[PDB]
Design a protein around this ligand. Structure first.
Ligand code: FMN
Ligand code: FMN
Ligand code: ORO
Ligand code: ORO
Lengths: 299, 299
């Protein structure tokens, strides 16, 4: 039995990594992710300059997941670039760098600088991604960034959107992975006890993660798995167990990202997840992920 | 203490009703809903002619809700029109008729005929609703339908869409209520044991209801509550308890629709929900819904 994944000219010990933004902002966090049992890691979605992010509380753990409006608190692009360039032990595992410029211009400028580090060190861009704005952003990055990269996608909720998004993504051969999904946007958690919202920014509206989002994540993983056969899908959303991960891979996921569960449990979770996924595969008589990836049975 | 709701020239004993499509397709179900403790009921979203709907299994109950791709199985407009015109006991409770024409023309033609029955009997249209198409549809319906009505909305996931949707709806004074929300569209449930999807239509993709959707429902209820101050909001999504309903009302809901929970429990649920909401209100020292409707506290 093996959880090994081979993709993007890299070998991964297992499909697991953090979801961008979860436990990957500080040096300590990046180190902890590198030292963890995870197959990879992704750095916090960065902007050109450090960002304080939104006022607190801006994250709330919930019985069925989480809600957040972090507001991109990050150490800035130079920080994550320097980690990728000078600090990350690529001997331990490959590194993804998540980028979330606040404009096309910002992404272009960061990508221009990232190019050299990707070339020299092998850091892989996960570009945090209105289909016109999407086409423009990808066009700009593809134009200036001389490497394959991946895109972190918001969830879509109908086939028309799955088709529209896939059509655009398929126009960009440099997009070699698609990460499905980011949060289900702008949920509103209300605490019955306090008769209030639970996060401060944006009147309590924030992205949902965790158990809430698993079927949506699976839908999106599978939708793009089907519609972008030339591309890899990374799953993200609602993974708390090896069984959840199994579902992601069955839907078509190559890598499996862990946000909310990781936020609650810390990087030790990856030891548990590898163990559980191996346990699931053992019970189901699977030896490799290739044996069932994308093989979800329809009726 | 009173769960009384007053809206659209009607008095409702309590805010509870079935969600359209749940236990409201047949004469039997409609009578059962009328005989229930619910404040109201809505008939299955109708098309001009009967529809068989999608191949089964097309609904699956889940730990955290439900997934369905029913495909609008319904007895056709004439059937629901006849129920409203000739059968429904308005002395028991008001009646909503859900309409879901597969084209604007179909809606227009059904509304032309519904007009007389709305006038004569007081049945209230809930029109099951692309913002261009939306405005166009509402214009066409408003043209031929000389009555107040409401619209059943899909969930939106950002403020851009809340704003755009609200702007359109606010163009139409006849739209006196907005029902938030229809299902979170096209989730994909995978059974880990069978390594398959759980519904047959559309490769297993289907609308999510129940616990999955509550924060999204609350977000939409509140978003439209804020943006459409001239209208009422009907809450729909993730109501299992009086406390969930409390949350709907706190977010801005006038009426509270129950889908998945009602599917699983049957119409006796309304007796439990009315009792539970009164229990919540008693603990919280509320006597009427007016006292906390829309009063969710932000930070
Ligand atoms: C604390 C918090 C911060 C996040 N920051 C980012 C971010 O920087 N960039 C990004 O693409 N996604 C970010 N996400 C979204 C996650 O990467 C992930 O898409 C989402 O949480 C769904 O996964 P989950 O169900 O495992 O939480 C963040 C999520 C949370 C909970
Ligand atoms: C079995 C099934 C059939 C449904 N049929 C309709 C329909 O006819 N028209 C409609 O507007 N919504 C329909 N819905 C969506 C519900 O009205 C409701 O918006 C959704 O289920 C969310 O509410 P819930 O969490 O209480 O289930 C249906 C939902 C289910 C579960
Ligand atoms: O930084 C954040 O607040 C954030 C970014 C993102 O892409 N997704 C999310 O849920 N939060
Ligand atoms: O009939 C259906 O399939 C259906 C209609 C609708 O509006 N919502 C839903 O979840 N299902």
């Amino acid at each position: 039995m093996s959880l090994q994944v081979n993709l993007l000219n890299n070998t991964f010990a297992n499909p697991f990594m953090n979801a961008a933004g979860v436990m990957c902002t500080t040096t300590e966090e990046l180190v902890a992710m590198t030292e963890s049992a995870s197959g990879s890691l992704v750095s916090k979605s960065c902007t050109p300059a450090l960002r304080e992010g939104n006022p607190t509380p801006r994250y709330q753990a919930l019985p069925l997941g989480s809600i957040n409006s972090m507001g991109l608190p990050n150490n800035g692009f130079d920080f994550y670039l320097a980690y990728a360039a000078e600090q990350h032990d690529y001997g331990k595992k490959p590194l993804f760098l998540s980028m979330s410029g606040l404009s096309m211009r910002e992404n272009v400028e960061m990508c221009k600088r990232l190019a050299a580090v990707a070339t020299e060190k092998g850091v892989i861009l996960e570009l945090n991604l209105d289909f016109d704005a999407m086409r423009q952003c990808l066009t700009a990055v593809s134009e200036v960034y001389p490497h394959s990269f991946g895109v972190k996608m918001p969830p879509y909720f109908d086939f028309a959107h799955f088709d529209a998004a896939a059509e655009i993504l398929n126009e960009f051969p440099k997009v070699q992975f698609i990460t499905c999904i980011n949060s289900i946007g702008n949920g509103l958690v209300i605490d019955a006890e306090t008769e209030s919202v639970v996060i401060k920014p944006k009147q309590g509206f924030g992205g949902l993660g965790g158990r809430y989002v698993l079927p949506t994540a699976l839908a999106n993983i599978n939708a793009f798995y089907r519609r972008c056969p030339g591309k890899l899908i990374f799953g993200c959303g609602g993974v708390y167990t090896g069984e959840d991960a199994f579902l992601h891979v069955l839907a078509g996921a190559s890598m499996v990202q862990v946000g909310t569960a990781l936020q609650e449990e810390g990087p030790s979770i990856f030891e548990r997840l590898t163990s559980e996924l191996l346990g699931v595969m053992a019970k189901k008589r699977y030896q490799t992920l290739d044996e069932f990836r994308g093989k979800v049975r329809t009726l």
